[PDB]
Each structure stands twice: as C-alpha cells, then as structure tokens.
Enzyme design. Structure first.
Site, short mmCIF file in Angstrom:
data_model
loop_
_atom_site.label_atom_id
_atom_site.label_comp_id
_atom_site.label_asym_id
_atom_site.label_seq_id
_atom_site.Cartn_x
_atom_site.Cartn_y
_atom_site.Cartn_z
N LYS A 45 0.88 -1.23 -0.03
CA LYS A 45 -0.04 0.01 -0.22
C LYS A 45 1.00 1.23 0.08
O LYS A 45 0.21 2.38 -0.13
CB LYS A 45 -0.87 -0.01 1.32
CG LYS A 45 -2.08 -1.04 1.10
CD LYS A 45 -3.04 -0.99 2.32
CE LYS A 45 -2.57 -1.54 3.55
NZ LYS A 45 -3.73 -1.63 4.52
N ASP A 91 11.95 -11.72 7.86
CA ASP A 91 10.84 -12.12 8.73
C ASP A 91 10.17 -13.33 8.05
O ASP A 91 9.54 -14.13 8.94
CB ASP A 91 9.73 -10.88 8.98
CG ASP A 91 8.74 -11.23 9.96
OD1 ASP A 91 8.75 -11.26 11.25
OD2 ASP A 91 7.73 -11.69 9.45
N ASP A 95 9.73 -16.63 10.06
CA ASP A 95 8.19 -17.20 10.55
C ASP A 95 7.84 -18.33 9.60
O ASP A 95 6.60 -18.57 9.87
CB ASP A 95 7.41 -15.79 10.51
CG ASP A 95 7.65 -14.77 11.31
OD1 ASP A 95 8.62 -15.02 12.39
OD2 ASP A 95 7.01 -13.50 11.56
N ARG A 100 3.13 -13.37 0.56
CA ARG A 100 3.04 -11.97 1.04
C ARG A 100 2.79 -11.09 -0.33
O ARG A 100 3.20 -11.12 -1.22
CB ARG A 100 4.58 -11.69 1.46
CG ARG A 100 5.07 -10.22 1.45
CD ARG A 100 4.97 -9.25 2.58
NE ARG A 100 5.33 -10.04 3.80
CZ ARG A 100 5.15 -9.85 4.96
NH1 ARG A 100 4.42 -8.73 5.47
NH2 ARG A 100 5.45 -10.48 6.21
N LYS A 188 9.25 -4.12 17.83
CA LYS A 188 9.62 -4.39 16.60
C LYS A 188 8.52 -3.71 15.42
O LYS A 188 8.97 -3.72 14.35
CB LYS A 188 9.13 -6.09 16.38
CG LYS A 188 7.47 -6.46 16.77
CD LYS A 188 7.25 -7.70 16.12
CE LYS A 188 5.72 -8.09 16.50
NZ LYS A 188 5.19 -9.62 15.75
N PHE A 227 -1.51 -0.80 15.29
CA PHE A 227 -1.46 -1.36 14.05
C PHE A 227 -0.59 -2.63 14.09
O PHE A 227 -1.04 -3.70 13.46
CB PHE A 227 -0.28 -0.46 13.31
CG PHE A 227 -0.12 -0.60 11.77
CD1 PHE A 227 -1.10 -0.17 10.79
CD2 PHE A 227 0.66 -1.65 11.34
CE1 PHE A 227 -0.99 -0.55 9.53
CE2 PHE A 227 0.75 -2.15 9.89
CZ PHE A 227 -0.33 -1.50 8.95
N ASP A 231 -2.51 -6.18 13.18
CA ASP A 231 -1.94 -7.03 12.43
C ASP A 231 -1.90 -8.42 12.96
O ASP A 231 -2.33 -9.43 12.30
CB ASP A 231 -0.35 -6.77 12.38
CG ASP A 231 0.51 -7.86 11.32
OD1 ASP A 231 0.26 -7.54 10.19
OD2 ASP A 231 1.29 -8.45 11.92
N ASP A 232 -1.88 -8.77 14.21
CA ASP A 232 -1.98 -9.85 15.03
C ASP A 232 -3.55 -10.49 14.84
O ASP A 232 -3.79 -11.52 14.50
CB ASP A 232 -1.80 -9.87 16.56
CG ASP A 232 -0.21 -9.55 16.66
OD1 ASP A 232 0.49 -9.54 15.78
OD2 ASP A 232 0.13 -9.31 17.78
O1 LIG Z 1 3.88 -9.26 7.90
P1 LIG Z 1 3.78 -10.17 9.46
O2 LIG Z 1 4.67 -11.12 8.79
O3 LIG Z 1 2.41 -10.39 9.70
C1 LIG Z 1 4.58 -9.09 10.58
O4 LIG Z 1 3.86 -7.79 11.04
C2 LIG Z 1 5.97 -8.61 9.79
C3 LIG Z 1 6.82 -7.68 10.76
C4 LIG Z 1 8.34 -7.86 10.42
C5 LIG Z 1 9.09 -7.31 11.16
C6 LIG Z 1 8.92 -6.14 12.09
N1 LIG Z 1 7.54 -6.14 12.47
C7 LIG Z 1 6.57 -6.57 11.91
P2 LIG Z 1 4.96 -10.02 12.04
O5 LIG Z 1 5.62 -9.27 13.34
O6 LIG Z 1 5.91 -11.14 11.56
O7 LIG Z 1 3.60 -10.39 12.50
MG LIG Z 2 5.81 -12.58 9.60
MG LIG Z 3 7.35 -11.98 12.65
MG LIG Z 4 1.73 -10.55 11.41
#
Ligand SMILES: O=P(O)(O)C(O)(Cc1cccnc1)P(=O)(O)O
Ligand SMILES: [Mg+2]
Ligand SMILES: [Mg+2]
Ligand SMILES: [Mg+2]
Ligand SMILES: O=P(O)(O)C(O)(Cc1cccnc1)P(=O)(O)O
Ligand SMILES: [Mg+2]
Ligand SMILES: [Mg+2]
Ligand SMILES: [Mg+2]
Lengths: 337, 337
Positions: A45, A91, A95, A100, A188, A227, A231-232
């Site tokens: 975005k 990441d 993960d 993506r 993070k 935010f 995301d979670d």
């Molecule tokens: O995109 P994601 O992967 O959902 C994430 O927000 C990506 C991200 C990468 C680096 C730093 N903070 C968030 P995450 O924390 O792994 O859930």
């Molecule tokens: Mg991730």
């Molecule tokens: Mg992560």
């Molecule tokens: Mg995430």
C-alpha cells in the site's frame, strides 16, 4: 492527501531502480538487485513511504518545496519502503510464511531459498546508497542516516524479543503476558512504522528539536502499537485476499495479542485446550485455537479495543501535535483506522 | 606489532559488551545479544580488528595517541570484527556450512536455526551503535559510517555474484571463468578485509585525501584477492584443526579458484570427470574432484601463485605506500603470507 500523491510516488520507483542500476563486471549482481527490488518493494500500500512525501508537503513552506526537494522527499519515502522490504524478506524466512502481498514469499520462490538472506541485506544497503546519492549535500544528511540505523536497531531488538518469546515446539503459555506483549510491539513495529517516516520529513523540514521529536513519538508509538495489534488480529481473522498473506502466528507459537487476550479470559479447561493445541502445524489443532478465540468473543474484544485506541490516539493528537499541523497525524490515523 | 597489542584488544571486548549491554523490558533481548556477540565475534585471529589499532599507532603522532583516542581505535577495531561476524553468520547459513572457528556454526546450534538471520542483523546494528557511542563528536564520524556502509554494500554485491555463479544442483562449468572469478573476489573479500581497517585508521588519523585512499586501495585490493584465493585453496587442502572450518566449495558448486585453475588445465576426459562429480553432496564424488585437482598439481600451482603474488604486492608497496609508512602494509603482508 495520499490518493493523488500515490501515482507520482509509485512512478518515481523506476528512477530509483535506474539510479541504483564500478564496471560492467557486477552486471549480473545489478540484474539480481533489480529483480529483488521489483519483487519485494512493489505490491504493498506504500503508506509508510507516502507518509514521508505527505508530511514533507505539510511541514515545508511551499516556496522551499522546489523540484529537487520533492525528488529528495520521494527518495526518502522509497528508503522507508526499502527498510520495510528488508525486514519482511527476513521475517518471512524466520516465521516460515507462505505468501506476502498476494504472491509467494521471495524465499519460497524456486531457485531463491536461503539466498534471500543476502537479498534482504542488499535492500538495506540500497537505503544508504540512495541517501548518499540524493541527500549527501543536505544539512539533515547525518540526521537521516542515524534515524534509519536507529530504526533498524530498535526493530531488530523487537524481532529478537518476538523470536525469544516464540521458541518452536516449546509451548509455555506463562511467558505470554500483557507486559511482554507491549515490549515486543513497541520495538518491532512502533518505531520504524510511523515514527521513522514522520521524523524523516521533520528533519528534511529543518525540525530537529528533541522535544518536537519526543512529542511526535508519543503519538506515533501508540499508533504503531495499535497497528501491530491489528496485524495480529488479521493474522487469524483477516481475509487473505485483502491482507495478501497467510497467517502463521498460532503454528509459530507467537506471543500474539489474540493469545494474550485469550489467556486473561480462559477458564482452566479452556487454558488446557489452548495448551494442547497452540504452537503446532496440524490444521485441526489451529482450528481448535480459532474456535476457542471465537468462543471467548476475541473479534468483539478487538472491535472494542480499536474504538478505545482510536479515541486515545485522538486525545494524544490534541495534547502533543502542536506546533506541527494536526493534519500530519490525522491523515495517518484515517489510513490505519 | 600485532602480538602484544592482541592482549589489550581482546581485553577491550568485555567493555564493548558492557557498553552494548531503554528500560529493563528489552532485558531478554540484550542477554541474547550478549550470547550472539560472545559466540560469533570471539575465537578468530582478530587480524582485521587489530589492523585498525596497529595502523592507528603508526599513522597518528604519539602526542595525539591519548587514552581516549586509543579507546576509539580499539572500538573501531571491534566494529570491523563485528562486520566480519555479521557476514560469516549469514554466509554459513547460505553456504550450508558445519563448523566455524573450531565450533559448530551458530545457525547449526540446537534452538538457533534461522533465528540466526536476525542475530546477524543485530551484529551489523552494533557497529553503528558503537560508532555513535564513541566517535559521534569526532571529525571523522561521517567518514567512518560511510566507510562501513560502503564496505557492507560492496561485500553484498560480491556475495550476490558468489551465489549467482553457484546455483545448487545446476552444474555449468562454462560459467567458471578467470574474469568471473576476479570480479567475485574483488567485491566479496578485498574491500572489507584489508581496505576497510586501514582506511578507518587513516580517517581517524586525519588522512581523508582521495589519492591517498586510492593508493592504499591499490595495494590492499590485491592483498584481498590473494587472501580469498588462499581461502579457496584451504577449503579443500587446508587442515580443519588450523582453519577451524569444514570446506563446502565443491558440494556447493562454487566458482572456486581451484575449479577455475582445474578448467584451464583439464583434458576433455578430465573435464567430463569434473562435470559428473562437481556441485554434489556425495563424499565419493567430492573425493574424485580432489583426486583430479591433485593429479593436475593444483597445490604446487597455488604455491607458485603465492610466491608470484607476494612479489607483486611487495612491488605495489614500493610504488604506492608513500607517504604512509611502509610498515603499515608490510606488517599486514607478513600476517597473511
Ligand atoms: O507481516 P507479518 O509477517 O504479519 C509482521 O507484522 C511482519 C513484521 C516484520 C518485522 C517487524 N515487525 C513486523 P509479524 O511481526 O511477523 O507478524
Ligand atoms: Mg511475519
Ligand atoms: Mg515475525
Ligand atoms: Mg503478523
Ligand atoms: O569462511 P568462508 O566461509 O570460507 C568465506 O571466505 C566467508 C566469506 C563470507 C563473506 C564474504 N566473503 C568471504 P567464503 O566466501 O564463503 O568462502
Ligand atoms: Mg562460506
Ligand atoms: Mg560464501
Ligand atoms: Mg571459503
């Protein structure tokens, strides 16, 4: 504010690639860099990168918003998108993610694999290459380098905390506390997401005062916390056709906002169901955790949290925006809420 | 020169850790950073880091070599060791290596795995943290930041070239040429290995002239080329109890100096033996490549190359050392040859 400005920003990417793409001996590496840039910095975005441009135009006097100053604003915007691309490529590996931005993760692409580690490092190097090429003779040059480096360090401390709290195949629900969760998200997500792009525009505008940066940070760190919580939530309850990515938080044993909320609402029997099914690959075990979350009405708890958070951030904008134009923070709040 | 100075340099590491180890909320991440520093920056020969200290003492006037200036020299030395640690942690993952500095690779350690990607990024972030903490008020501060960032970019371009030329399970001997080999080594090894530590000491000494840096680079890039060629030789013919690492170049389909030398000396039948056995896991196939190398007397070819290279670098020291003390380059040449 972001709408029409999006086109000119996305159009500037071809210039960034051209400027980044010293003899023809490194030709194959430059072609690989182009490939990495096109796959990993395009398709999102662009809100973080656009925030530099939008904030620049609202903080800098229109007489000082010359053609060269706008070019520098767009480049610094793309530097923020590149920092984001570097962290997401690494990441996704760490993960064990699948998609993506509506496409398979770069590392999951046939022929890429763990070479993606160096590709992610190249994306990070491009930032400082662009800052030198466009901002070397500017008085805010060192402020910008230090800002991007500091944002990278804080994000990495956060990633360390994220990974430490989620050891694979080691379910320990006692570790998933509210205090631990707030610490992870702050480092993070909150610094690089919203503070980095606004601070960059502020330094470019000559706003380098400690108290002004601290006041902006108070609003922006709270928006960053929201935010990451959102995301979670979207990792499990979001539509992947909108999010562009498949969720892995339950399988990866993450200290998600959802597991933290579950834990403070679960009965001893519900706790046992979570204990038996969390941090595991099996689709049936993941489905049991989601069922428990839905039973504890975590989607309604999140909707209430979004409302309470929005009002809180708005109260922070009223307290801390001055002397910056409140539109800087309002435009951003409308975009993420 | 390096001998007695080694003790004070290694003793300064505890201070670096203490200074790098903002509320107690990130306590577990700081403990992980300490663990990463102790495992990955300790156990080597410290020649790159020691070169900053040795060169500083030979370039700076003794009256200007005060207690605080020495502290900064030791820190900049450890920054070079940290850049090296960041690249080795990531390179061990990408090359699927087993040991490093006489111990299992960090990523091969139980409970670490691909979390090592973020650990490697934290090591890189520590560099700029140390440069700010100790050199922020120094006139060479920006020169050092730009030098470390430029060295990182050039090394990564080199790694890109290394990985592009070695696609897994894709044997293409035609790609392994002398011109391709010289390009890889120049970028991945020569800039960060010897030019980075001497250039750092030069900037700290007030030597920031373009021609002086270009002349030092002409000597140092050639020493870096030799060092990588020797590294490739020792991958197969070195004693792992001395090198501290197991070789993977043949298994990983690398454009090694050994395969390049093999190719310009091999008969059509020998070429076929190489074609059938290169870039494969099987111990018997690797043994066939080593047998071919020994048959083509590649260890004697390397011994002749080391002699010719030494004399060439010495001729370059005579041409390009001035006005720097030749001992700067001689001490380094005695250490790597
Ligand atoms: O995109 P994601 O992967 O959902 C994430 O927000 C990506 C991200 C990468 C680096 C730093 N903070 C968030 P995450 O924390 O792994 O859930
Ligand atoms: Mg991730
Ligand atoms: Mg992560
Ligand atoms: Mg995430
Ligand atoms: O230690 P190695 O692993 O033998 C190596 O020299 C390590 C290295 C890492 C990064 C840049 N340049 C050399 P490589 O090239 O992989 O042979
Ligand atoms: Mg290697
Ligand atoms: Mg390698
Ligand atoms: Mg090697």
């Amino acid at each position: 504010v972001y709408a029409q400005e999006k086109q000119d920003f996305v159009q500037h990417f071809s210039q960034i690639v051209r400027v980044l793409t010293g003899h023809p001996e490194i030709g194959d590496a430059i072609a690989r860099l182009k490939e990495v840039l096109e796959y990993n910095a395009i398709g999102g975005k662009y809100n973080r990168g656009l925030t530099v441009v939008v904030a620049f135009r609202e903080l800098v006097e229109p007489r000082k918003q010359d053609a060269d100053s706008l070019q520098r604003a767009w480049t610094v915007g793309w530097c923020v998108e590149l920092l984001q691309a570097f962290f997401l490529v690494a990441d996704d590996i760490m993960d064990s993610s699948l998609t993506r931005r509506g496409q398979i993760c770069w590392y999951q692409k046939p022929g890429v694999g763990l070479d993606a580690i160096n590709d992610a490092n190249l994306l990070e190097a491009c930032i400082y290459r662009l800052l030198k090429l466009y901002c070397r003779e500017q008085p805010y040059y060192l402020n910008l380098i230090e800002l991007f480096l500091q944002s990278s360090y804080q994000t990495e401390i956060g990633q360390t905390l994220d990974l430490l709290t989620a050891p694979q195949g080691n379910v320990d629900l006692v570790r998933f506390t509210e205090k631990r969760y707030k610490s992870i998200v702050k480092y993070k997500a909150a610094f690089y997401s919203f503070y980095l792009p606004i601070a960059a525009a502020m330094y470019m505008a000559g706003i380098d005062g400690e108290k002004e940066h601290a006041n902006a940070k108070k609003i922006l760190l709270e928006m960053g916390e929201f935010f990451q919580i959102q995301d979670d939530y979207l990792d499990l309850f979001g539509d992947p056709s909108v999010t562009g990515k498949i969720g892995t938080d339950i399988q990866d044993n993450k200290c998600s906002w959802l597991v933290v909320q579950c834990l403070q609402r679960a009965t001893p029997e519900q706790y046992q169901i979570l204990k038996e099914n969390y941090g595991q690959k099996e689709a049936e075990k993941v489905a049991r955790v989601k069922a428990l979350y839905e039973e504890l009405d975590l989607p309604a708890v999140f909707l209430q949290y979004e409302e309470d958070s929005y009002s809180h951030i708005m109260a922070l904008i009223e307290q801390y925006a001055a002397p910056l134009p409140p539109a800087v923070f309002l435009g951003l709040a409308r975009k993420i809420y």
